[PDB]
Each structure stands twice: as structure tokens, then as C-alpha cells.
């Protein structure tokens, strides 16, 4: 019984300043318990966004994102070479609170 | 209030087939019991093996063991198999923002 989340893509490349756009859908409603987290080889994954929309201490203004309920938008207004990186989803309304598949970003 | 802080060690770590692989993840601050152990592999959620320090989520072999309350944690794989090889991180979830240790990755000698 536990919440499934479905995040997509799996993979994608984009080139510097470009708008990047991630979502993920829970199997039910979570209300805006969801997070964003990303993720560098060889670091700990850091949470960005929670609450569907909060930002993070130091977490620029081109990261946001949105949704309620059932499916969730992050969004990079503006790729950097920073933001190279793996991001996930995570549901925290019920316990265990699941993660989707993950997004790895490249330079195109 | 800080963010927690999780001090994970080792960063990466060699050993045989069977062998007993210890890992430990220290918070900066008394967590009581909410702190998870995940495995990544690439491609993958995030995948559960003990929840609230030291509970087995369903259906995890039992070779995966976790102890500890308060600020000292122990993960334990008792047998290494060749598929376990992957990396593995501990989670606090006493307080938002949740925040990872730094990762464990493991190889076969």
C-alpha cells in the first residue's frame, strides 16, 4: 500500500539557460508534502524545495516548484553548470515516505 | 534552529563476498529515533531498508540491520553479496529541511 511515485524523464539533456521542467505524480493525494532533492556523485542528495513550493536556505531564485495533490512541477528557469545533477521527488504524507526515480540532467 | 547535520563514514569502503560491512552516521543534533538508511543505485529510487533507526522495512533481506538513538547510528550488511554493491546514505527526519550523510560506496575486493 505504499504511495507510489512516478517522476519524469529518467534522463535529459539541455543546454545552458535553458528552462528545465521535471514532474512527478503520487498514487494519491498528498495535499503539499512533496520534495525536491538534488543530488552530485559522491555528495549528500540536499532538499531544495519542500512543501511543493518553499525554497531552501541559499537556493537560488530560478529553482521552483509547484502542484498539490496528485502531480508536482520543479522547474530551472534557467540551467547552470551547477545544476548538473540527479533530483529526485519525495512524498512525506505517509510513512514511508517514497521517493520517485529520479531525474539525471546533462549538458546537451 | 540549524539544519541537521549527518556525518557519514566511510565515504567508500572495499571488502569480499560475505564480509560484515559497518557503516555509521552521527547527527549534529539528538534526532530520538527518526533516521532512515537508504541504497541507491543508479537509475533507482532511493531504496528503504530501515526505518526509525533500526526497523526493517517490508520485504528488505534481514542481512540489513540498523542501531542507535539519539546522535550515534550503525548500519550493518552481516553477509555481503554481489548484489548489494551500490551506494548507501542515512536520512533524518526529526525536523525539516530532511538532510542525507554523505554516502557510502561500496566495492568488491
Known amino acids: 500500500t505504499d504511495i507510489q511515485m512516478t517522476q519524469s524523464p529518467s534522463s535529459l539533456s539541455a543546454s545552458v539557460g535553458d528552462r528545465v521542467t521535471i514532474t512527478c505524480?503520487?498514487?494519491?493525494?498528498?495535499?503539499?508534502?512533496?520534495?525536491?532533492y538534488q543530488q552530485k556523485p559522491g555528495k549528500a542528495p540536499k532538499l531544495?524545495?519542500?512543501?511543493?513550493?518553499?525554497?531552501?536556505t541559499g537556493v537560488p531564485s530560478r529553482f521552483s516548484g509547484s502542484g498539490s495533490g496528485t502531480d508536482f512541477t520543479f522547474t530551472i528557469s534557467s540551467l547552470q553548470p551547477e545544476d548538473i545533477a540527479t533530483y529526485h521527488c519525495?512524498?512525506?504524507?505517509?510513512?514511508?515516505?517514497?521517493f520517485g526515480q529520479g531525474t539525471k540532467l546533462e549538458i546537451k | 534552529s540549524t539544519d541537521i547535520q549527518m556525518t557519514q563514514s566511510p565515504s567508500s569502503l572495499s571488502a569480499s563476498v560475505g564480509d560484515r560491512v559497518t557503516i555509521t552516521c552521527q547527527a549534529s543534533?539528538?534526532?530520538?529515533?527518526?533516521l532512515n538508511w537508504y541504497q541507491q543505485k543508479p537509475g533507482k529510487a532511493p531504496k528503504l531498508?530501515?526505518?526509525?533507526?533500526?526497523?526493517?522495512?517490508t520485504g528488505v533481506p534481514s542481512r540489513f540491520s540498523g542501531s542507535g538513538s539519539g546522535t550515534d547510528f550503525t548500519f550493518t550488511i552481516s553477509s555481503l553479496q554481489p548484489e548489494d554493491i551500490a551506494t548507501?546514505?542515512?536520512?533524518?527526519?526529526?525536523?525539516?529541511?530532511?538532510?542525507?550523510?554523505?554516502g557510502t560506496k561500496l566495492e568488491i575486493k
Open positions: 512543501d511543493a513550493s
Open positions: 526509525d533507526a533500526s
Open positions: 519525495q512524498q512525506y504524507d505517509n510513512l514511508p515516505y517514497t
Open positions: 543534533q539528538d534526532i530520538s529515533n527518526y
